[PDB]
Amino acid sequence: FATMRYPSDSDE
Numbered sequence: 001f002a003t004m005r006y007p008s009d010s011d012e
Contacts (some may be wrong), residue, residue, distance in 0.1 A: 003009035
């Protein structure tokens with residue numbers, strides 16, 4: 001399943 005991390009899982 002895709003993460004809902006901060007800012008995004010693989011942006012910064």
